Amino acid sequence: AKSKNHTTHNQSRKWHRNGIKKPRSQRYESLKGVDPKFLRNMRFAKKHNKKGLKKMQANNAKAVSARA
Amino acid sequence: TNTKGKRRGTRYMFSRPFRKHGVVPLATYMRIYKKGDIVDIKGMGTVQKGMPHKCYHGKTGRVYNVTQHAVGIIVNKQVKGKILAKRINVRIEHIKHSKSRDSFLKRVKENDQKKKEAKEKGTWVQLKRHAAPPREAHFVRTNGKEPELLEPIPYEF
Amino acid sequence: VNVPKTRRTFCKKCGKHQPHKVTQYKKGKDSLYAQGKRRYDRKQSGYGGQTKPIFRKKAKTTKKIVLRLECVEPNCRSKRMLAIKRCKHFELGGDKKRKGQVIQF
Amino acid sequence: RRPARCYRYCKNKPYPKSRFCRGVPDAKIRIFDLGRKKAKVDEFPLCGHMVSDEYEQLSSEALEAARICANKYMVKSCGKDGFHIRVRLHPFHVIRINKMLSADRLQTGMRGAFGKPQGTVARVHIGQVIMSIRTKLQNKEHVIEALRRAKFKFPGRQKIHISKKWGFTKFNADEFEDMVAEKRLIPDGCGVKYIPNRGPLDKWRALH
RNA sequence: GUCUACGGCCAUACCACCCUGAACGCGCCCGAUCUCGUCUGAUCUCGGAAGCUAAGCAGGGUCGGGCCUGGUUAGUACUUGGAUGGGAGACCGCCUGGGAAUACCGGGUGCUGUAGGCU
RNA sequence: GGGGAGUUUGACUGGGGCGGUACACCUGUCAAACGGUAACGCAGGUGUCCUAAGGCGAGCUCAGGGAGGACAGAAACCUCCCGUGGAGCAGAAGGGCAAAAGCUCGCUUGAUCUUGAUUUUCAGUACGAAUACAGACCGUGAAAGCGGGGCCUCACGAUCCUUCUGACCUUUUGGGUUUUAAGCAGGAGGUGUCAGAAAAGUUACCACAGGGAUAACUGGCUUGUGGCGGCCAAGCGUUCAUAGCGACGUCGCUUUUUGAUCCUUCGAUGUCGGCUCUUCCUAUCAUUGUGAAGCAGAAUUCGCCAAGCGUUGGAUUGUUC
RNA sequence: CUGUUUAAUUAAAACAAAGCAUCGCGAAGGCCCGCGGCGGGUGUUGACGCGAUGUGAUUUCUGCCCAGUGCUCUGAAUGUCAAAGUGAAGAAAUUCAAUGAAGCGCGGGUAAACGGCGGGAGUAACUAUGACUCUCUUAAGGUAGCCAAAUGCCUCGUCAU
RNA sequence: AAAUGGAUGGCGCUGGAGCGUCGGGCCCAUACCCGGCCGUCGCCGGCCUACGCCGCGACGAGUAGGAGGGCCGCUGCGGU
RNA sequence: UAUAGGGGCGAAAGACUAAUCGAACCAUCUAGUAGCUGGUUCCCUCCGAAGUUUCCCUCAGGAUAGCUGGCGCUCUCGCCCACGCAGUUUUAUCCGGUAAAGCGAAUGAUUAGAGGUCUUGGGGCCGAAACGAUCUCAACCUAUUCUCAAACUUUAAAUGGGUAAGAAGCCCGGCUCGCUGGCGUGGAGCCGGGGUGGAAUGCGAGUGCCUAGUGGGCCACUUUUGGUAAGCAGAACUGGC
Numbered sequence A: 001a002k003s004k005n006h007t008t009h010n011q012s013r014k015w016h017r018n019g020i021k022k023p024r025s026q027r028y029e030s031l032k033g034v035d036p037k038f039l040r041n042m043r044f045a046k047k048h049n050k051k052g053l054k055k056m057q058a059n060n061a062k063a064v065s066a067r068a
Numbered sequence B: 001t002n003t004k005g006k007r008r009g010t011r012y013m014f015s016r017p018f019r020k021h022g023v024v025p026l027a028t029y030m031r032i033y034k035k036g037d038i039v040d041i042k043g044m045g046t047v048q049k050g051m052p053h054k055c056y057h058g059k060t061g062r063v064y065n066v067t068q069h070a071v072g073i074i075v076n077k078q079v080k081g082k083i084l085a086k087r088i089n090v091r092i093e094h095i096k097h098s099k100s101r102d103s104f105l106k107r108v109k110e111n112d113q114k115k116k117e118a119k120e121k122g123t124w125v126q127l128k129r130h131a132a133p134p135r136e137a138h139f140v141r142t143n144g145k146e147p148e149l150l151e152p153i154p155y156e157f
Numbered sequence C: 001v002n003v004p005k006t007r008r009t010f011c012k013k014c015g016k017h018q019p020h021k022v023t024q025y026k027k028g029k030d031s032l033y034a035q036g037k038r039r040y041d042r043k044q045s046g047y048g049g050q051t052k053p054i055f056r057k058k059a060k061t062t063k064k065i066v067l068r069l070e071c072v073e074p075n076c077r078s079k080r081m082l083a084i085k086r087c088k089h090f091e092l093g094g095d096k097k098r099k100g101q102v103i104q105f
Numbered sequence D: 001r002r003p004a005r006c007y008r009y010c011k012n013k014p015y016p017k018s019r020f021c022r023g024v025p026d027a028k029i030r031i032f033d034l035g036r037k038k039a040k041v042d043e044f045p046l047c048g049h050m051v052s053d054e055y056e057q058l059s060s061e062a063l064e065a066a067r068i069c070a071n072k073y074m075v076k077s078c079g080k081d082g083f084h085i086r087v088r089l090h091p092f093h094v095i096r097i098n099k100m101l102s103a104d105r106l107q108t109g110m111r112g113a114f115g116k117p118q119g120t121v122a123r124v125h126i127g128q129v130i131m132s133i134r135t136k137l138q139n140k141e142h143v144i145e146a147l148r149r150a151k152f153k154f155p156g157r158q159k160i161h162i163s164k165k166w167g168f169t170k171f172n173a174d175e176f177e178d179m180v181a182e183k184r185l186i187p188d189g190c191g192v193k194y195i196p197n198r199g200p201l202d203k204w205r206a207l208h
Numbered sequence E: 001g002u003c004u005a006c007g008g009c010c011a012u013a014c015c016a017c018c019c020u021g022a023a024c025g026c027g028c029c030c031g032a033u034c035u036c037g038u039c040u041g042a043u044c045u046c047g048g049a050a051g052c053u054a055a056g057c058a059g060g061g062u063c064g065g066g067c068c069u070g071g072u073u074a075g076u077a078c079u080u081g082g083a084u085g086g087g088a089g090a091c092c093g094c095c096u097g098g099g100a101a102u103a104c105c106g107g108g109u110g111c112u113g114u115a116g117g118c119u
Numbered sequence F: 001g002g003g004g005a006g007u008u009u010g011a012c013u014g015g016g017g018c019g020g021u022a023c024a025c026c027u028g029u030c031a032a033a034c035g036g037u038a039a040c041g042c043a044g045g046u047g048u049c050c051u052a053a054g055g056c057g058a059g060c061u062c063a064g065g066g067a068g069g070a071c072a073g074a075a076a077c078c079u080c081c082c083g084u085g086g087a088g089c090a091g092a093a094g095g096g097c098a099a100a101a102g103c104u105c106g107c108u109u110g111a112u113c114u115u116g117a118u119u120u121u122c123a124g125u126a127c128g129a130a131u132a133c134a135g136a137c138c139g140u141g142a143a144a145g146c147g148g149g150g151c152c153u154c155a156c157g158a159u160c161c162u163u164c165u166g167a168c169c170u171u172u173u174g175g176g177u178u179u180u181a182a183g184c185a186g187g188a189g190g191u192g193u194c195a196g197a198a199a200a201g202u203u204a205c206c207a208c209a210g211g212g213a214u215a216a217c218u219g220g221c222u223u224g225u226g227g228c229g230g231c232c233a234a235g236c237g238u239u240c241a242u243a244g245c246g247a248c249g250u251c252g253c254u255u256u257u258u259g260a261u262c263c264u265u266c267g268a269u270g271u272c273g274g275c276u277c278u279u280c281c282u283a284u285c286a287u288u289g290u291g292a293a294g295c296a297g298a299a300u301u302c303g304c305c306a307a308g309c310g311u312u313g314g315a316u317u318g319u320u321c
Numbered sequence G: 001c002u003g004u005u006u007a008a009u010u011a012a013a014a015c016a017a018a019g020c021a022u023c024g025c026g027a028a029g030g031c032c033c034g035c036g037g038c039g040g041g042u043g044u045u046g047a048c049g050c051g052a053u054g055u056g057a058u059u060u061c062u063g064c065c066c067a068g069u070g071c072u073c074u075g076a077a078u079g080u081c082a083a084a085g086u087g088a089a090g091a092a093a094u095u096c097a098a099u100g101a102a103g104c105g106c107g108g109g110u111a112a113a114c115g116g117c118g119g120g121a122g123u124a125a126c127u128a129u130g131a132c133u134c135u136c137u138u139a140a141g142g143u144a145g146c147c148a149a150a151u152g153c154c155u156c157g158u159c160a161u
Numbered sequence H: 001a002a003a004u005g006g007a008u009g010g011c012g013c014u015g016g017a018g019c020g021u022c023g024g025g026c027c028c029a030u031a032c033c034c035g036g037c038c039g040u041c042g043c044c045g046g047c048c049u050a051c052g053c054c055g056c057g058a059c060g061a062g063u064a065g066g067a068g069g070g071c072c073g074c075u076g077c078g079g080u
Numbered sequence I: 001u002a003u004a005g006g007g008g009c010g011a012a013a014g015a016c017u018a019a020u021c022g023a024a025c026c027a028u029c030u031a032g033u034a035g036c037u038g039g040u041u042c043c044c045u046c047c048g049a050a051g052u053u054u055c056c057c058u059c060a061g062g063a064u065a066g067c068u069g070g071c072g073c074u075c076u077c078g079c080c081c082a083c084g085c086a087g088u089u090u091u092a093u094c095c096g097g098u099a100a101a102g103c104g105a106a107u108g109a110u111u112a113g114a115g116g117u118c119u120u121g122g123g124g125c126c127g128a129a130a131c132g133a134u135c136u137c138a139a140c141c142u143a144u145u146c147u148c149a150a151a152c153u154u155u156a157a158a159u160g161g162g163u164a165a166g167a168a169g170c171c172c173g174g175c176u177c178g179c180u181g182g183c184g185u186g187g188a189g190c191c192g193g194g195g196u197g198g199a200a201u202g203c204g205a206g207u208g209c210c211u212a213g214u215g216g217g218c219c220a221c222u223u224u225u226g227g228u229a230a231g232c233a234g235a236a237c238u239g240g241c
């Protein structure tokens, strides 16, 4: 009882009925697969930022506000 | 039944061009690749360490990871049903920059320069592109020379 | 294949490359009261008859060769198993082959 | 042997004899030049051509029969050693046959019916020359009649044409007698060598 | 107008032959005691500076061979879409668009990135 | 211990069986210049080998050819020259490689540990294979660097059970010690029908549910084969191609043979031959009227309009023949 | 031969038959029935008997093979070998060791037990075919008979009627 | 040259009712345009059963299958 | 009168055993199981397919994905400018090895002629024989010449594949790093104020859950594999039943 083996007929119609839209592009996609050393350095820079940010950046903001 | 394989059917795709065999040129190594730049993929046969799959040949994608001898590229591979954003780790031997992004950057620089320069003069410059418009009415010239008559040649075997 | 009898390899216990001694691995005999043999015996006992199946249709010709690496450092006695690809003929210790030899038959 | 009706058109890709056939019967034709091969280029001025009008296949046996007919007519029309014929078409496409049940339904119907090679044919395109004959200036009607006789033996539909070229060379007949006088064409047996101007000066010093 | 050291493009810059090279530089070249290695100081290594552009090398030339580019081949072979177009078929023509290569001919044959010595 | 009882008799398949594995995995074409794409489509392979044929560093350049040297001869060894891969890289092919991935030399096991993410068939599940990292210990070179197997594309295996390795680990049930057992992680013992049941044959004494998804009848599509014609004309025909044939080639009709496919028929179309009987077809055996011969007559051979009329009696064979 | 056979598609060449052979058994036995008993059939029986097979009037013939598959017999010289029993180690579970009943393996016999019975080369004063001979094989190579048979594909074999 | 008598569809057609190139008219589909009516959807409008009453526009085929409405229908029970 | 159902009986046909015998009849398990046939009941309205991927002792089936429907939910227009999307085009940008073409270019096949001969082999000539000399053929080389390659290729189309055409972007200043490091070097992260009109056309989009049916297809223009061919078997895009 030989039958049909494999065809791709009437497949593009099934695909285009729902759509072949591109994947959802969003900001801050992901951080997976990134170098572990680079990720560790980024975490350290993010967690040590508020130590010196809230003072020197505030002083510079006051200075630029006095400038303009 | 078609003998699916990792390098099936790349006899002419992964081969080096004619009169271009030998060691790799050193200019392709000194190129800088940062995160977020749009690059292209072209499989090279000189090295076989980090070559991509035959389905990503000629594909353009952005870089999301950088390492010592390779780069991570997010490629939009169209599977039968939809498109998947796949992360691929390929060495720098098979990657080159995309001039489309460079042309776009040059165009946006020209635009933000032209507008900044014309704001003072008050001239509303048309920096937005357009399609090729139909040519306007022009005046040809014959300078007294009569147009040459064209006649179809008789058939000859 | 041919393998060396002694090779300095990373030791899991002390965390350092120590000279281990390579020997052949022999599958130990399955002793009784192993919680699988007891269950098998209790299942076979009775009038049922061959509760568990016996494997037929053997296809694999040879097995995978594994080596027992034992660390020679005193008061360490670290033992490990190292597997290699399948092979028909395996030889534990022999002379090294050379080039420009006297292979004349 | 199967008739020529079933091996007329071009239905399959070229299947030449190579390392993948590993078996093929020998062709029917063995010789392509039948006139005087040692003739010079100034011996036979004109030349005819059998140009095919249909894109089909020509069998080597048909080529053999047609060239035998042409030679038999020519050696009687203008005598032996007075012409030069050439079958330009060469057979390389190998047609395969599938012998059917060596007569009973015991054997397989179409299971593994790739078949074995049967013979060799020649693929001809529209406008491709099959045969070409060179003779003297007065044997025009004789060449035309020989090509007409070969037409009745070749299948399909092919016409006759007397080319403006000089013999077998790619040069015209009008620009040949004046270009061979001065050093621009060198006759070498049945062919002519065209000497270009972009060569070393020693080749020009050797002449003149 | 040139070379050396390090390099990008990787024959417009490779191959064979023939001419020129002033002042630096490259090299040829002279010698094995120490560093070093072979049968051999030929090659690789520490000592040079008696001669040389003979060679490499750098330029120029060949109605030179290759390489690049441009005409010819040619709107030709092909090809997207169309017809109730032709033909018995094989195949072909038309409309709307894109458009190849070999013969043949003509032109070129290195340009530059950093440090340095000369006329 | 078939005396008796239970159960099984792989799948694909131009019907089924036999044949073969297209059932697991690769190379080139098929494949229509992204990827993908079938047939019992083509041309081939694999279930291994390597303590080096892995890694590093250095040196050298291969196959072949040209001209010479005592035995030396086509091929022994030495020297010079040409030598862009025409050799070699373990094995089937494709790609790739020249101070190299090829040969030689010296040290070496990175062919060792560990957690993730990613690529490949993909349902984007697993196995296998592979990529780039990261964390410790080492190899190598002076060093930049390379190496966590073979230059790349295949060379291999779930659950349960068994065995081995490690914690100076967890539980062994009212509380302690010990043997033992169970428990965590990773290596092996196999499912080649290779995402993995433990399996012989016959039934013409056969039964059941179904199938025209699937053979043995007919009919239908093509005519390879069979039969029947045409064209060319090398030759036979004492002479002479075509009175009569006509090779080498080539173009057509037929379903009165066989074969190819399985479209209707499986809740049945009663499947060989013979006897009796009707009608039709013409590619005419004879008869009516004709043309041509190598037609003296007679007897013959080749065609034309031509199916109106006939085309028998028996021996053996079920026989068509 | 007489006889019997598929009631309701077969009457036979089938079955049966006397005859011819072979096997087991001397009764605490041979062949069988039986869930059970020293329960039952042969057996109110005893080798001229019982039980199990093959061939199938009379005559003459009963060829050769025990290699294989079956049957049977032998010696604790001899290999494998379960429970149970013995010794040892261990605190014990447990482990090891010594010995080892039938059977299997080894050897002999048996084919009126199942069965089988090949293939090359040189040799006659017309030549061939072939008297005769050499050689591989396994256990032996179709002897006496008979035939295109109810057994022969080629085959509608060849010759005579 | 093929077997029941028979197929440009038939009758028939030859200054065409045949072939090739064409012109002006004409014939009709559930297609197009205009208009009425029914339903769905969207937008809605109003402080007239709000689960009701209106307005505009665009669309309506369909096996297997999935939903919504029924003031369609049969039986029995609690209210009316 | 004795033998009663895996039993009896059988001069053996697997025949007979109450019209049933290659395993009787009666009742129960039992409404045994069936991937297999047949059937499956009222109206209207709306939406509306698949015969395809992978796996299975899988091929008359099932699971998975895909196609479909329902329930929603989150926003956007409606009073010089939109978020976003597209079976499409335009502009830049690479990717490829088909059609075609070539082999007086690599590899493998391939017909014939012309010249030169270093050597090799076969013939004829001078003549004790002799690379002492000569004519010719085969072989080799050179420059041409005819015809081909789905598993050849220098070159190389059309069609076609991916990306980009902005506010998720650019310019400026300052902080953090245990990452790297001559250097306040490089690279990432964060903060702060200033500047939207960025190719054409068309359109409202995004997302969650549940889910039936399907899992035998066929035909056509064109490109194609096996076959002589088939209303034959097997593929790619599109359309149709």
Ligand SMILES: [Mg+2]
Pocket: A003, A004
């Ligand atoms: Mg199917």
Ligand SMILES: [Mg+2]
Pocket: C046
């Ligand atoms: Mg027991």
Ligand SMILES: [Mg+2]
Pocket: none
């Ligand atoms: Mg020394």
Ligand SMILES: [Mg+2]
Pocket: none
């Ligand atoms: Mg020394």
Ligand SMILES: [Mg+2]
Pocket: E041
């Ligand atoms: Mg020296």
Ligand SMILES: [Mg+2]
Pocket: E053, E055, E056
């Ligand atoms: Mg010099």
Ligand SMILES: [Mg+2]
Pocket: none
């Ligand atoms: Mg000089």
Ligand SMILES: [Mg+2]
Pocket: E064
């Ligand atoms: Mg030149």
Ligand SMILES: [Mg+2]
Pocket: none
């Ligand atoms: Mg077209």
Ligand SMILES: [Mg+2]
Pocket: F002
């Ligand atoms: Mg049984």
Ligand SMILES: [Mg+2]
Pocket: none
């Ligand atoms: Mg089957």
Ligand SMILES: [Mg+2]
Pocket: none
């Ligand atoms: Mg394609």
Ligand SMILES: [Mg+2]
Pocket: none
């Ligand atoms: Mg492709």
Ligand SMILES: [Mg+2]
Pocket: none
């Ligand atoms: Mg090296």
Ligand SMILES: [Mg+2]
Pocket: none
């Ligand atoms: Mg290879």
Ligand SMILES: [Mg+2]
Pocket: none
């Ligand atoms: Mg190669």
